[PDB]
């Protein structure tokens, strides 16, 4: 057979922090360190289908913070797509797993998930995750 009820999930690991206004965000974050955060994502979750994850894309963002005492806001992130993820609830033989994007993202990235409707400027925890459906109704297997 074929299981045609899997989804592709766009995932993003975020570190948002403040730095002194005379510094640059690239003194704190590197493409190398963000790639190593990606390597720490769980790649064998019970909800994971075949074909693993896309190439990770590191990103560094900087802006002066109006509300801070002379500080800049740094947003260091690494994004990738989980090509094939199960839909619904999944029984692995011993227990149930919720394969919804929020609980799936939190298990795989290990940080609290926030809906894309909540902007980075309205999130006050330092480490968090993003996850949303980028493709629905894909095969769960690689064929
Ligand atoms: Zn198939
Ligand atoms: Zn299949
Ligand atoms: Zn960091
Ligand atoms: Zn970082």
Residue numbers in the entry: -2 to 140
Which lines from the publication concern this structure?
A small secreted protein with 37% amino acid sequence identity with AvrLm3 was identified from F. fulva. The analysis of the anomalous signal revealed the presence of two Zn-clusters in the structure that resemble those of the Ni-ions in AvrLm5-9. Strands β1 and β2 are connected by a peptide composed of a helical turn and a short helix surrounded by irregular peptides. The long connection between strands β3 and β4 contains a β-hairpin, a short helix and some irregular peptide stretches. The sequence alignment and structure superposition show conservation of all 10 cysteines, suggesting both proteins form an identical set of disulfide bridges. The sequence similarities between AvrLm5-9, AvrLm4-7 and Ecp11-1/AvrLm3 are relatively weak (between 18 and 28%). Nevertheless, the 3D structures of all these effectors are strongly related: AvrLm5-9 and Ecp11-1/AvrLm3 share the same fold with AvrLm4-7, which displays suppressive interactions with AvrLm5-9 and AvrLm3. All three effectors have a disulfide bridge that connects the N- and C-termini, and also at least one disulfide bridge that links the helical connection between β1-β2 and strand β3.
The Dothideomycete Leptosphaeria maculans, causal agent of oilseed rape stem canker or blackleg disease, is one of the fungal pathogens in which suppression of ETI by the presence of an AVR gene has been demonstrated. Among them, AvrLm4-7 suppresses Rlm3-mediated resistance triggered by AvrLm3 and Rlm9-mediated resistance triggered by AvrLm5-9. Surprisingly, despite low sequence similarity, AvrLm5-9 and AvrLm3 are structural analogues of AvrLm4-7, sharing an anti-parallel β-sheet covered by α-helices. Structure-informed sequence database searches identified a larger number of putative structural analogues among L. maculans effector candidates, including the AVR effector AvrLmS-Lep2, all produced during the early stages of oilseed rape infection, as well as among effector candidates from other phytopathogenic fungi. These structural analogues are named LARS (for Leptosphaeria AviRulence and Suppressing) effectors.
